[PDB]
């Protein structure tokens, strides 16, 4: 576990076995854990992608670390995922876990599918970022962003370092997940991967204005 160090606003990284006599740590107030989102890294942030990048395995214990600071998310998820018979898919979040409150859009998703036994984890190990908490598991009805966690030493300086989109899922990734974006309980639009949170809002407002069970964008 490397530690970033900020010197004259320049990142340096201090390795565990490398002695740096210029790293001045007067107190632990200079030590921070920072959550960053998988957004500024240039990847897709839509709902179909989120499904594809997630998977399950049983027998894998839960793991949690915290953080004090982090990035704002353009795209968060809040999932209330059920088995076809109504049984819960996702585990309950443990006490003290709160959904992440710093999202411009929240991809609130429900619907049904087979939900293979196990916990839902990220395919490349990204953390699910909950309010001030990072963990390896997706929890039920809890808002989170997806990202990574850095640790670092700050210099002693005075720098100080919404919209809900409702979707319905189709089988959680069984070689197809046709998501529909819900405009109303009686109005659904085919979700196309190039339709951003912003376009989904525009589509919702436009069809509502025009009187609305399934519709397509037809661009």
């Amino acid at each position, epitope marked *: 576990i490397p530690l970033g160090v900020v010197h004259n606003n320049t990142l340096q990284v201090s390795d565990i076995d490398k002695l740096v006599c210029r790293d001045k740590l007067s107190s632990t107030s200079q030590l921070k854990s920072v959550g960053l989102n998988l957004e500024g890294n240039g990847v897709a942030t839509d709902v179909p992608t989120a499904t594809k990048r997630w998977g399950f395995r049983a027998g894998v214990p839960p793991k949690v670390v915290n953080y004090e600071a982090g990035e704002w998310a353009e795209n968060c998820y809040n999932l209330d995922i059920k088995k*076809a018979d109504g049984s819960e898919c996702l585990p309950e979040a443990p006490e003290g876990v709160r959904g992440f409150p710093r999202c411009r859009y929240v991809h609130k998703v429900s619907g049904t599918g087979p939900c293979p036994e196990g916990y839902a984890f990220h395919k490349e190990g990204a953390f699910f970022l909950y309010d001030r908490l990072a963990s390896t598991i997706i929890y039920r009805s809890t808002t989170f962003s997806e990202g990574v966690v850095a640790f670092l030493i700050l210099p002693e300086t005075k720098k100080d370092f919404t919209v809900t989109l409702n979707y319905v899922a189709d089988n959680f990734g069984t070689n*197809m997940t046709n998501f529909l974006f819900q405009v109303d309980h*009686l109005t*659904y639009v085919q979700l196309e991967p190039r339709f951003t949170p912003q376009f989904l809002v525009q589509l919702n407002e436009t069809i509502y204005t025009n009187g609305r*069970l399934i*519709w397509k964008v037809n661009p």
Partner: antibody
């Protein structure tokens, strides 16, 4: 093995609304398309819209627009057809059946796009499980 | 909706006799998805054939379908007393799917 069970025969007056119920009976109806028919005497099977309890959308038949509600409670085992404005033409044996026990894109078919206008899409598959039927006698 | 008819509409047959039933759609059926099913009065219908010719689950070899486009048939070999049913067709190759009026098989 699931065997769908329909309610028994009943006698109804014209103008009434008959809520026809079917039990999954060895299964549930959760996300499955439950199709219905009306076997009026001397006729074949008149098709009615499929019901999904845990629905996105459900279908409807054209001949029953404004006449039949297609509905079930989420994650239930009872499915219903609400036959409003009952007429003697509705004296029939009604049946419930399972066909496409997973509404998904293969189950989403319909008229093609007309840019500026949109179409809903729904489709059901081969009905493998048919339940018992209910004779609804309609007075006139 | 979609129009479908059936023919001859009546078949007076001896038990053990081989006979062919026909169904006609007003339109071609995509992927030849025509179903055949049968019921005797008082019974719920049971799927015999799906996909024009393929046998449905639990269906004996005596039932074999065929056809293409709008034109389909069902051949029943060794007709048993249990098979003197009214046979019906349904189109799953279009939407909304549709049903024919039935073909009656009866004992001679």
């Amino acid at each position: 093995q699931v065997q769908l069970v329909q309610s028994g025969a009943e006698v109804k007056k014209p103008g009434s609304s008959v809520k026809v119920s079917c039990k999954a009976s060895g299964g549930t109806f959760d996300t499955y398309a439950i199709s219905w028919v009306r076997q009026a005497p001397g006729q074949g099977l008149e098709w009615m819209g499929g019901i999904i309890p845990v629905l996105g959308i459900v279908d409807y038949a054209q001949k029953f627009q404004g006449r039949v509600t297609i509905t079930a409670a989420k994650f239930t085992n009872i499915a219903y057809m609400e036959l409003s404005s009952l007429r003697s033409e509705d004296a029939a044996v009604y049946y419930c059946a399972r066909g496409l026990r997973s509404l998904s894109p293969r189950g989403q078919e319909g008229p093609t796009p007309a840019p500026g206008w949109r179409r809903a899409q729904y489709h059901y598959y081969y009905m493998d499980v048919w339940g018992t039927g209910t004779l609804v006698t309609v007075s006139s | 909706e979609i129009v479908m008819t059936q023919s001859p509409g009546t078949l007076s047959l001896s038990p053990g006799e081989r006979a062919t039933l026909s169904c006609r759609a007003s339109q071609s059926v995509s992927s030849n998805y025509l179903a055949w099913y049968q019921q005797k009065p008082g019974q719920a219908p049971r799927l015999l054939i799906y996909g024009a010719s393929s046998r449905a689950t639990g269906i004996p070899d005596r039932f074999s379908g065929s056809g293409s486009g709008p034109d389909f048939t069902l051949t029943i070999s060794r007709l048993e007393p249990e098979d003197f049913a009214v046979y019906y067709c349904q189109q799953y190759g279009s939407s909304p799917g549709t049903f024919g009026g039935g073909t009656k098989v009866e004992i001679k």
